[PDB]
């Protein structure tokens, strides 16, 4: 009755048309791609270490 009038009028005349994905993006955290932090190269590598170790490990303190 009142259900029908309201139903008809409301449903028919209401047209969705929301924000684009581009507009949406601002209101969200955007996609993150791979991070790719490389491979760090550590100490105790190179002949800096070797000469150091021969010499250093010739005398140590108590």
């Amino acid at each position: 009755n009142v259900i029908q009038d309201l139903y008809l009028r409301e449903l028919k005349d209401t047209k969705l048309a929301p924000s684009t994905l581009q507009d949406a993006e601002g209101n969200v955290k955007p996609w993150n791609p791979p991070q790719k932090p490389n491979l760090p190269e550590l100490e105790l590598q190179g002949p800096e270490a070797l000469k150091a170790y021969t010499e250093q490990n010739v005398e140590t303190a108590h």
């Binding site: 969200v28 955290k29 955007p30 996609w31 993150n32 791979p34 991070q35 932090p37 760090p40 550590l42 105790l44």
Partner: protein, 52 residues
């Protein structure tokens, strides 16, 4: 007194070499673990952006 010092040192000399190896060996394994950490990280970030 001198004998006492000496006896300690004998046992030390071998066993300390064990620790020497052991310590650096563990550190190597732990290096490889960093690559695991990066797997964990990227996935966590991805879920979060998606949740937003």
């Amino acid at each position: 007194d001198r004998i006492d010092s000496v006896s300690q040192l004998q046992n030390v000399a071998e066993t300390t070499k064990v620790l020497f190896d052991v310590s650096k060996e563990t550190v190597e394994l732990e290096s490889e673990a960093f690559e695991l950490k990066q797997k964990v990280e990227l996935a966590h970030e991805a879920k979060a952006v998606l949740d937003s």
